[PDB]
């Protein structure tokens, strides 16, 4: 006994550590602020120190929330028409989300499991379990009037009996295309930035753009190094021009590897192997939506979608301790290290009237005692990593 209990122990442990962390950094932020702003002190603490510590307080509050959340959030991200909606529709075995040519998905869509045997949707502040067939009115931009305003979230519920993956506490998120408008991008941040796992749906007819990559650098800048699956979707395109298939596949694989391993430095090359796939959502959906001449390599592309689903499931369940917590604990260690440096910098600055020197040594004592609280927390995080991680 048991996978579930191992997770709940881990959650209580790390959440409790992060409580201590957040109060520590808030206190240190107030100390540094006070020292910087005091007109009596010859530049003891710097503005940069203050901004960094304030940034860390914010960072840690948001990460705190992410840790304590009841659910594992998976955000789907990509350019317009790479295949985000269609990938989810394939995982669900039915065309249940708005999909098509042009800009379509014009709202954010939660997808969760339900114990009931029928699907439904719910809208901002409504108990009403509306028909899943109403989606287009709310989420499909060829239906929606161009006036409709700044939000939104529509929560789709799909029966757990159909679709294994939705059990339990998993939440999939279909979003709009990146880089369509500034406002849409700011909403894509608000909704998707704090996701536990990202599925980058790339267009395998094309290659990876920098605006697509920039998002994941932003995730790291604001929170922690992102857990990323790359689906090179539309791979059925390579059935035309088989004389280059392997060369094109090699190009994508090399570029995606470079993105995860060299640019983000989130994963090593061997790990990245099991995060990059070549698939056709369209084919998988078409085949699945049928069990009451085929295009070449269909079966290979199907088997890789299945591998993606297997590995995706292995992470949000078996390795949910790792998936939910690891990257945030690493970032916690990093932030603490920098906080220690700031406290040291303030201490040494303090070394260079009787009331004025007495005030200055009080800053020294404060900075040292904060420093050792930081080392205590570093040890508690190191213990957590030992007892709960590889």
Ligand X SMILES: Nc1nc2c(ncn2[C@@H]2O[C@H](COP(=O)(O)OP(=O)(O)O)[C@@H](O)[C@H]2O)c(=O)[nH]1
Distance CA 199, CA 80 (A): 14
Taking CB under 6 A as the criterion, the residue among 11, 73, 84, 234 binding ligand BEF is 84
Q: How far is the CB of 104 from Mg ion (least distance, A)?
A: 5
- Binding ligand X (rule: CB under 6 A), the pick from 29, 35, 105, 110 is 105
Does 110 sit near ligand X (CB under 6 A)?
A: no
* HEC letters along 205-216: CCCCCHHHHHHH
- Scanning 240-248, 284-292, 310-318, 336-344 for contacts with a copy of itself by CB under 8 A, the matching segment is 240-248
Q: Is 85 annotated as a binding residue?
A: yes
Stretch that binds ligand BEF, among 97-105, 218-226, 309-317, 349-357 (CB under 6 A): 97-105
Token code pair at residue 367: 């900075």
Residues 6 or more apart whose CB falls under 8 angstroms from that of 230 comprise: 200, 202, 256, 259, 260, 275, 276, 277
With CB under 6 A as the contact rule, the residue among 29, 35, 81, 110 that binds ligand BEF is 81
Using the rule CB under 6 A, is 238 a contact of ligand BEF?
A: no
Q: Is 85 an interacting residue with respect to Mg ion (CB under 5 A)?
A: yes
Nearer to a copy of itself, 294 or 348 (CB): 294
Query: Which of 104, 230, 257, 349 touches K ion by CB under 5 A?
Result: 104
The residues with which 243 forms a beta bridge, in sequence order, are none
E runs forming strands in 234-359 = 276-278
| C-alpha neighbours within 13 Å on the C-beta side of residue 288 | 23
Q: Assess contact for 67 and 18: CB atoms under 8 A.
A: yes
Residue 156, classed as helix, strand or coil, is strand
Asked if 100 is part of the footprint of a copy of itself (rule: CB under 8 A), the reply reads yes
Quote the least distance from Cβ 116 to ligand X, whole Å. 26
106 forms part of the interface with Mg ion (CB under 5 A): no
Distance of closest approach, residue 164 Cβ to ligand X, in angstroms: 22
Q: Which stretch binds Mg ion (CB under 5 A): 1-9, 78-86, 88-96, 249-257?
A: 78-86
| 84 marked as binding residue | yes
State which of positions 50-89 bind K ion (CB under 5 A).
81
CB 169 within 8 A of CB 71: yes
Asked if 104 interacts with ligand X (CB under 6 A), we say yes
CA-to-CA distance for 315 and 338, rounded, in angstroms?
30
Q: Would strands 170-174 and 197-203 be described as parallel, antiparallel, or unpaired?
A: unpaired
The CA distance from 185 to 108, in Å, is 12
* Residue 136 found at the interface with ligand BEF (CB under 6 A): no
Instruction: Say how far residue 34 (Cα) sits from the centre of its chain.
Output: 35
Task: Find the helix packing angle between 354-388 and 3-37, rounded to 10°.
Answer: 170
Residues lying near Mg ion in the complex (CB under 5 A): 84-85, 104-105
Which residues carry a binding-site annotation for GTP? 81-86, 233-236, 280, 282
Residues lying near ligand BEF in the complex (CB under 6 A): 80-81, 84-85, 103-105, 176-177
């Amino acid at each position: 006994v048991s996978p579930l209990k191992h997770f709940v122990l881990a959650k209580k442990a790390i959440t409790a550590i992060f409580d201590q962390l957040l109060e520590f950094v808030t206190e240190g932020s107030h100390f540094v602020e006070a020292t910087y702003k005091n007109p009596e002190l010859d530049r003891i603490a710097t503005e940069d120190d203050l901004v960094e510590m304030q940034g860390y307080k914010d960072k840690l509050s948001i990460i705190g929330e992410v840790l304590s959340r009841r659910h594992m959030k998976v955000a789907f991200f990509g350019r317009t028409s790479s295949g985000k909606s269609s990938v989810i529709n394939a995982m669900l075995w039915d065309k249940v989300l708005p999909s098509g040519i042009g800009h379509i998905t014009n709202c954010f869509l939660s997808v969760e499991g339900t114990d009931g045997d029928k699907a439904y949707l719910m809208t901002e502040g409504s108990d009403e379990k509306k028909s899943v067939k109403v989606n287009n009115q709310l989420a499909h931009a060829l239906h929606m009037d161009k006036d409709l305003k700044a939000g939104c979230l529509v929560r789709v519920f799909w029966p757990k009996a159909k679709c294994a993956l939705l059990r339990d506490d998993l939440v999939l998120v279909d979003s709009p295309g990146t880089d369509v408008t500034t406002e849409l991008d700011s909403w894509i941040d608000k909704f998707c930035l704090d996701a536990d796992v990202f599925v980058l749906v790339a267009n395998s007819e094309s290659t990876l753009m920098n605006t697509e990559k920039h998002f994941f650098h932003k995730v790291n800048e604001r929170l922690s190094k992102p857990n990323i699956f790359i689906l090179n979707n539309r791979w059925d395109a390579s059935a035309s021009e088989p004389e280059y298939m392997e060369d094109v596949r090699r190009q994508h694989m090399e570029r995606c590897l470079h993105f995860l391993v060299e640019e983000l430095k989130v994963v090593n090359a061997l790990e990245a192997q099991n995060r990059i796939f070549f698939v056709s959502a369209k084919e998988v959906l078409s085949a699945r939506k049928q069990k009451a001449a085929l295009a070449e390599g269909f079966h290979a592309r199907l088997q890789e979608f299945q591998n993606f689903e297997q590995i995706f499931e292995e992470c949000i369940s078996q390795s949910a301790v790792k998936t939910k917590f690891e990257q945030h604990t690493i970032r916690a260690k990093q932030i603490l290290a920098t906080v220690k440096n700031i406290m040291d910098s303030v201490n040494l600055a303090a070394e260079d009237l009787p009331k004025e020197i007495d005030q200055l040594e009080k800053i020294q004592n404060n900075s040292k005692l904060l420093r050792n609280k930081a080392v205590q927390l570093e040890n508690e995080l190191e213990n957590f990593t030992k007892q709960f991680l590889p």
